[PDB]
Design a protein around this ligand. Structure first.
Ligand SMILES: CCCCCCCC/C=C/CCCCCCCC(=O)O[C@@H](COC(=O)CCCCCCCCCCCCCCC)COP(=O)([O-])OCC[N+](C)(C)C
Ligand SMILES: CCCCCCCC/C=C/CCCCCCCC(=O)O[C@@H](COC(=O)CCCCCCCCCCCCCCC)COP(=O)([O-])OCC[N+](C)(C)C
Ligand SMILES: CCCCCCCC/C=C/CCCCCCCC(=O)O[C@@H](COC(=O)CCCCCCCCCCCCCCC)COP(=O)([O-])OCC[N+](C)(C)C
Ligand SMILES: CCCCCCCC/C=C\CCCCCCCC(=O)O[C@@H](COC(=O)CCCCCCCCCCCCCCC)COP(=O)([O-])OCC[N+](C)(C)C
Ligand SMILES: CCCCCCCC/C=C\CCCCCCCC(=O)O[C@@H](COC(=O)CCCCCCCCCCCCCCC)COP(=O)([O-])OCC[N+](C)(C)C
Ligand SMILES: CCCCCCCC/C=C\CCCCCCCC(=O)O[C@@H](COC(=O)CCCCCCCCCCCCCCC)COP(=O)([O-])OCC[N+](C)(C)C
Ligand SMILES: [Cl-]
Ligand SMILES: [Cl-]
Ligand SMILES: [Cl-]
Ligand SMILES: [Cl-]
Ligand SMILES: [K+]
Ligand SMILES: [K+]
Lengths: 861, 861
């Protein structure tokens, strides 16, 4: 658990200081000037400072523990950005391994050719030595990670003594080091090297070789689970290492340009002052002409100086072979820090199953779950690029991919500050979103100036990887590590949904379904899944009827189990379990306390209870008063009834019930639905069949809108209903008007209905009313104003509508029927249940429905 | 209301056939070969066929009436794509006007220099004549648009007779048309021109000049409000005009390549067979050497042939000066068709206030609301480009902008097919989304090959115009981005949150705050808004205690009032109003029914009942049994108490009530917040002060921990406290272990605690208890096992903890103390209140808190 120095600053300084510090800093002052190379260093420092502020803005957005480089970006921002940043950054480190070990092998090859050892040609010995040192770094990565955390301060004190040896060796004018270039600090060599030469390169061709010397700044953010306090450790160490390394780069460029000439023959001259005919700032007796190129379209056939030999810092240095062999400390550290950092990002990326096929590079073998397949993939990508045994073609690829990664980071923090992402509050003092936009545009434009077709390929790939993660299914076991953003999104969307204008008032029918346990009664789940499918809100209520000692402990586990079952099938429904001693006071909990904000259930849809006369006659009072508790909260009451019941508890008629309970989700809609618009203030009675008719399962549904009308004028009433049907855009005009209602209600069925309520001539479980009978009357069966004195017409109309249902709606899928409402108290519950059961005697799957008559058709605008 | 021919096909063939048909088709066979130019025409036909299928997918998305070109795109797709397509297409037609009139002016200048009329140099006469003909087309556009609808069939029959004149003039071998090239159809000239020459150009530099001759296909879709049946007229006419014009281009290229030589001196030769030393296919006695260029880096110094003269189709034609000078019919139509079409799209774009400043270019003067400021802007953008009086530099700009517009159309229909947009069902037979994606990628890649920095500028501008309209104040032509998209996103994110893995299980505390009316008790709003902000979920509850006949009618008005009252302040809380007979059952309504899915309240926070000794002891049973009902559902319980009141019933004592009822939103913190960790399995007791301490108000507040224990090891248990505090992310060393609990409970304070319960000494506000003790024994004060026998040490512990709180916590902002829990049934409710009120007598704003010991510290991972 390191501090900020040993955990961030030392790692970032060892990662930044790499190949170009000793190998290629003098060549950059050779090609460009001192002024242009300083402009190059300031440009790279601006890019990496803006990216350091964006990384510090990410690192201070909470989310400390269980960190890394992929983790912070993927948790603060979305998966769509973080997956592409992880892939591009992993590939950038994988290709950078090759660059660092190619620089190491080139240094070893030139030190070998300074002796007599030479096996094959020069460009093949780099492949041999680079292959040998990449199979040796992989073994250190997969077998020796323990000593590496102690070795890094030793590598840093080798490297800083190398830098100090070069810087104090420049001040010592040696006459033996003349003819290799390197006179003392002179004004003539300062003025001569002020201004570009560009002997085969250009600006933005020299810059693309420098820019790998500025990368490696995310080596402090690559350990957030090994830091003490990351929100203080990362912005100090990263933004201080950038300053220190950039200042050392500026000092090396200015010091190399002011003491070494651009070309030099390695032959000493006896003169101390040359003959006065050259004036090329070499007044120490060296004539360095006939070493510059003749034409302006070729490289020089010289061998020393700033342009030619690539190793002049070992000449300038006070002690060459051992202190300025900190190149072996600079390259081999950085390559190693890029060999352990690409499979880390790629294994954290393959544990969230964002991209489909790459998920086999996450199985970490061993005790630490080190990704060995990721190490072998990184070894393959590095060894493919090693065989291009030339630094000046590998380095622009590294610059392209790291510039793409840094532009993605800056654009992602800009876009998250712009969009007001819900979990995005970057408490960092020097973060600005417009600076991040400027840095992203700068990296993208420079990436196109360096090479336009490589940049176009990279941007097309990143755009494809963004659009793929945007439009892909949000189901479970897909990227489930990123979960804390979904909570804040679901909270802020509901917080915006609760606040709208007070004069819009869209209807959007919500519904709670008294279904019991959701694995039981599946037909009502499929039928209230038919309508309110990405249209409204569905809700499954379940009242547990345990009276004494309710098992409050196992309610949460059973709720989570039932919700996981309901999510494992196709359903857009939530689940609410309450616990009471009966059904009515149990559903009183969910009538007036369900939902949050505007996601409250509007209508109540229940099933019909067929077993009301078979046994337990008490609970009928719990069932009708429920409806009388549903009509008082201005809800909508929907009753569903099949030919047989829905309560499934598991042979011939049992299989008939089990097959009728799943008659919707698997079958089709061959056969017409038909509504019966009888009440004018129904409302929802027409919204329901239009919603259930526009579905995949329902195509062959001719909505036969029936309406009881005036008997005198049967001509224009159907036109006045047809314009309302055109207003509701249900798009059918098969309207049939009836006039034979309440005429002669089939007295042989009147004798069936009168013998139905014959044991209930005194009302059901009304012990107060029954004991209040005896204080006025002795014969009990004389109160009939409640029962049949004032409501002959209601019962006659109910049985007449039953006969019309049997006649006109013989073959049908559903029947949307307006539900008869009677005022409570004056009408008993048993009489009302008798009317509802005689209205829907042995029909097809009818649907009694009565709305709140507040306002409809505000839906669909 | 035209048919498909006269309204789509004639318009598209007049817009497509333009400059390059007669001026620059033969030069394209001059630079490239016949094979490469045929490849060029087939590639342009592929791009325009894919874009025509995308336009026909857009045009068949319903939406017949109220047409246009911006309207169809902006209404089928979104405004973000439609605004950028409208802007880029308007700019492309505005710059295309200049290309067509520059071709016209160049033709008139060459016809003038064939005579003796020559005012200034050649490149200035084009500027003069082009300026004169653009100030004349503008007057026709703003004053003579009626005759143009009749003139177009006359223009087309001029143009087709020009094409037929050229094609029948090729078959007539004239010996006078020799020496300007043009032998008959020969096999030697066909074999000589099969293969590129590229005398100063490249492939994709010749394609970029051809591709403006394939554009113009959106001239049929640009009039959809003047069309009879657009879903038949637009694909038929567009996809037939593309085939006709491409076949004519292929025919012109093949015919011109096989009868004219590339270079020719305009001098006749007396010979009929050349001397047998050349063999360069001119065996008709013409030595056409000494016009081929010497080096491979210059143009030929010749004057005729395919490479040089640009007007060789007037030489091949049978009647030159009148029929094949139907270039005046080809250019001046197309320019006019691009002068009436850029202000049209730019005025339809500026009537939707999408982009801010451009809204003044929409005020249409006159009767038809013709956009005159748009006409003047198009005139200015054209006239700035006519001053570059060269066709071969104007034409790649037109190619880049039209390729950008076609790529935007193709990508937009692919993105609308991919995302399943709500109103996107393109009933067209030959639409495929992957063909559109291929066309978009092809147009983008070709746009980058032609000129990479112009393409990069165009893509940056189009991306900026997309991201601007994506994130804006919503002012769309409809309100589907206000109520529909918000509901869909909120419901699908609630369903996404409710379905996750069962083993993640973060805590993320949600709170049921009992405030009553939210304009009352604002201190509890500010306190449980301090924590559970940007972390959890706040759910303010209000019970209505209306017993007799509760109102349910206008309670929706009260809920919509108080929700807007919450949202007008900076609060993120939801509101739930229930109605019961007392507060306990009303809170029990919200304990098991509030929230949906995973957004249910886990904790319950109430305010302490200050006036419980004054009157109405019968409701204290409703307060304590609420707490015992809160602990039954495994809820955490937080109780807030102030020394003064909490609610606001609206002189100077009321002032100190009101000024301390709002003591959190306008004050700050400079000092300490102290906790009293006294229970092992609390967990939330430390989670709450860490959450309230990380706030902008509570920045200067140090957390001080108090803890009981033993006396032998007081430096040992604070280490065990410090490691779990480091596990709880506070890490404060102000943990002072005390050893004064249940030791010596300060006998002078026992008198007030004894006299407080003195009217309750065996009167615990229960009728059943008094009824049991009136017949069990004869004295009242009998069952005192709960009163003093079994719970003496508990009451002495509370009465000692109060004095410890007064000693060590006299001046503090917040006091977070653990709450004593007793077992119900045995311990009286009045005894429970006697324990709770003694703990918080004259204290700062204390906070009693007891967790549910389920799982904490899974928060922050
Ligand atoms: C090659 C090298 C490239 C380098 C330069 C690259 C150019 C890019 C340079 C961009 C820097 C310039 C923009 C800064 C100005 C902001 C003004 C301001 O301060 O007010 C406010 C903004 O409100 C505004 O007024 C925004 C005005 C800027 C819109 C211009 C976007 C540029 C699109 C570029 C299109 C491509 C450009 C090219 C197209 C041809 C401040 O912001 P805020 O709303 O208060 O939010 C802060 C919230 N903080 C509180 C989160 C916590
Ligand atoms: C001036 C303006 C000019 C503008 C010009 C613009 C032109 C610029 C051009 C930009 C091109 C960008 C478009 C490509 C995006 C395609 C996405 C896609 O098709 O995926 C889909 C299927 O496809 C698959 O299943 C493929 C498997 C995954 C591959 C990811 C896509 C290819 C990435 C290659 C990277 C190589 C990686 C190499 C390194 C590893 C997603 O499948 P789904 O889940 O079923 O989605 C259904 C959505 N629904 C549920 C809502 C119905
Ligand atoms: C590897 C991959 C590398 C990736 C590298 C990335 C590639 C680089 C991509 C870079 C794309 C850059 C996108 C910048 C977005 C613009 C800023 C914006 O959104 O509006 C801002 C200001 O807006 C204004 O006030 C001015 C309105 C126009 C500005 C945009 C058009 C400029 C370009 C057209 C020029 C003329 C063209 C016409 C002539 C043809 C919004 O301001 P706000 O105060 O914040 O509003 C708050 C409301 N909100 C919170 C809801 C938001
Ligand atoms: C350079 C210039 C030249 C460029 C030219 C070459 C460029 C290459 C461009 C495009 C290449 C063409 C892609 C062909 C894919 C067809 C397979 C298929 O039919 O899937 C289908 C079958 O659904 C399935 O059964 C699953 C099959 C996997 C989906 C394949 C997606 C490939 C993503 C490739 C990502 C490429 C990213 C490119 C990044 C560079 C799924 O979709 P659908 O059912 O058909 O939906 C129809 C809906 N509709 C009826 C409304 C329309
Ligand atoms: C590698 C993948 C193959 C893809 C095949 C695709 C089919 C390609 C078909 C054919 C391939 C192209 C053949 C001709 C090459 C263009 C020659 C040319 O005109 O010079 C060009 C550059 O000069 C170069 O450097 C060209 C080097 C090759 C780049 C083109 C391949 C990239 C294809 C896309 C890679 C991304 C793939 C995206 C995802 C699919 C132009 O130079 P300029 O300075 O810009 O012009 C100045 C204009 N001015 C004079 C008016 C100022
Ligand atoms: C040279 C490269 C060739 C291609 C160039 C590309 C041409 C560009 C032209 C047209 C293409 C348009 C680009 C985005 C495509 C839309 C699809 C999408 O992302 O859906 C997402 C939308 O996304 C957004 O809302 C913001 C856009 C973010 C884009 C960031 C890309 C970063 C890659 C940088 C690399 C590119 C660098 C370009 C060069 C500088 C999600 O869909 P949604 O849920 O419906 O969102 C609704 C949000 N709302 C409710 C607030 C409205
Ligand atoms: Cl380096
Ligand atoms: Cl990096
Ligand atoms: Cl043209
Ligand atoms: Cl067009
Ligand atoms: K580096
Ligand atoms: K054209």
């Amino acid at each position: 658990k390191f501090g900020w120095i040993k955990g961030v600053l030392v790692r970032c300084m060892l990662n930044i200081w790499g190949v170009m510090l000793f190998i290629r800093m003098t060549w950059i002052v050779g090609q460009a000037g001192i002024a242009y190379s300083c402009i190059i260093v300031i440009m790279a420092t601006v890019v990496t400072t803006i990216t350091g502020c964006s990384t510090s803005a990410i690192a201070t957005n909470g989310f400390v523990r269980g960190g890394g480089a992929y983790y912070l970006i993927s948790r603060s921002l979305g998966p769509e950005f973080g997956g592409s940043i992880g892939l591009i950054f992993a590939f950038a480190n994988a290709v950078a391994v090759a660059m660092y070990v190619v620089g190491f092998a080139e240094t070893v090859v030139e030190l070998l050719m300074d002796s007599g050892l030479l096996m094959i040609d020069q460009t093949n010995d780099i492949r041999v030595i680079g292959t040998i040192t990449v199979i040796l770094l992989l073994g250190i990565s997969v077998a020796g990670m323990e000593w590496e955390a102690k070795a890094q301060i030793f590598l840093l004190v080798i490297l800083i003594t190398a830098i100090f040896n070069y810087f104090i060796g420049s001040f010592i004018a040696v006459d033996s080091k003349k003819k290799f270039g390197f006179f003392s600090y002179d004004a003539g060599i300062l003025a001569e090297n002020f201004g570009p030469d560009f002997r085969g390169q250009t600006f933005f061709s020299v810059f693309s070789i420098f820019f790998p010397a500025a990368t490696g700044i995310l080596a402090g953010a690559n350990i957030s689970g090994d830091l003490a306090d990351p929100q203080m450790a990362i912005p100090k160490g990263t933004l201080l290492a950038i300053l220190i390394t950039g200042l050392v780069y500026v000092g090396v460029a200015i010091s190399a340009g002011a003491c070494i000439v651009r070309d030099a023959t390695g032959i000493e001259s006896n003169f101390t002052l040359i003959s006065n005919c050259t004036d090329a700032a070499c007044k120490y007796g060296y004539d360095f002409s006939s070493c510059r190129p003749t034409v302006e379209g070729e490289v020089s056939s010289c061998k020393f100086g700033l342009h030619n030999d690539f190793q002049v810092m070992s000449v300038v240095s006070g002690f060459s072979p051992l202190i300025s062999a900190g190149i072996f400390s600079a390259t081999l550290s950085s390559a190693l820090a890029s060999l352990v950092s690409a499979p880390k990002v790629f294994q954290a990326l393959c544990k969230d199953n964002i991209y489909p096929g790459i998920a086999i590079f996450g199985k970490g073998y061993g005790k630490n779950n080190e990704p060995l397949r990721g190490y072998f993939l990184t070894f393959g990508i590095a060894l493919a690029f090693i065989l291009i045994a030339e630094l000046n073609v590998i380095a622009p690829i590294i610059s392209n991919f790291f510039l793409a990664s840094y532009a993605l980071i800056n654009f992602s923090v800009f876009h998250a500050s712009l969009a007001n992402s819900p979990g995005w509050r970057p408490s960092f003092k020097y973060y600005n979103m417009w600076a991040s936009l400027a840095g992203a545009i700068l990296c993208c434009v420079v990436m196109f100036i360096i090479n336009w077709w490589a940049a176009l390929l990279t941007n097309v790939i990143v755009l494809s990887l963004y659009i793929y993660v945007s439009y892909k299914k949000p189901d479970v076991n897909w990227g489930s590590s990123t979960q804390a953003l979904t909570y804040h999104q679901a909270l802020t969307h509901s917080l915006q949904l609760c606040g709208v204008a007070d004069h819009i008032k869209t209807f959007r029918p919500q519904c709670l379904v008294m279904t019991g346990a959701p694995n039981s009664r599946p037909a009502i789940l499929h039928l209230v899944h038919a309508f309110t499918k990405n249209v409204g809100l569905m809700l499954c209520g379940h009242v547990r009827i345990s009276s004494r000692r309710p098992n409050f402990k196992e309610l949460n586990s059973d709720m989570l189990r039932y919700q996981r079952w309901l999510l494992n099938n196709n359903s857009k429904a939530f689940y609410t379990c309450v616990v009471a001693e009966d059904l009515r006071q149990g559903t009183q909990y969910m009538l007036q306390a369900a939902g949050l904000g505007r996601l409250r259930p509007n209508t109540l849809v229940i099933g019909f209870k067929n077993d009301w006369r078979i046994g337990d006659i008490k609970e009928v009072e719990t069932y009708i008063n429920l409806i009388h508790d549903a009509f008082d909260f201005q809800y909508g009451v929907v009753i569903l009834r099949l030919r047989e019941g829905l309560d499934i508890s598991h042979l011939n008629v049992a299989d008939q019930r089990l097959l009728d309970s799943q008659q919707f989700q698997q079958k089709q809609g061959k056969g017409t639905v038909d509504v019966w618009w009888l009440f004018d203030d129904g409302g929802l009675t027409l919204l329901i069949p239009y919603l259930i008719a526009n579905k995949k399962k329902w195509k062959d549904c001719k909505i036969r809108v029936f309406i009881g009308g005036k008997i005198n004028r049967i001509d224009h009433d159907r036109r006045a209903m047809a314009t309302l049907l055109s207003k509701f855009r249900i798009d059918f005009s098969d309207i049939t008007v009836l006039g034979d209602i309440n005429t002669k209600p089939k007295s042989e069925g009147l004798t069936e209905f009168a013998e139905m309520i014959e044991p209930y001539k005194l009302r059901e479980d009304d012990m107060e009313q029954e004991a209040a009978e005896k204080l006025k009357s002795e014969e009990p069966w004389r109160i009939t104003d409640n029962e049949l004195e004032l409501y002959k017409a209601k019962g006659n109309r109910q049985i007449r509508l039953n006969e019309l249902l049997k006649e006109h709606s013989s073959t049908a899928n559903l029947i949307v029927m307006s539900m008869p409402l009677a005022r409570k108290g004056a009408v008993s519950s048993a009489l009302y249940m008798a009317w509802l059961d005689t209205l829907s005697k042995d029909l097809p799957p009818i649907l009694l429905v009565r709305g709140n008559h507040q306002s409809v058709l505000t839906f669909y605008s």
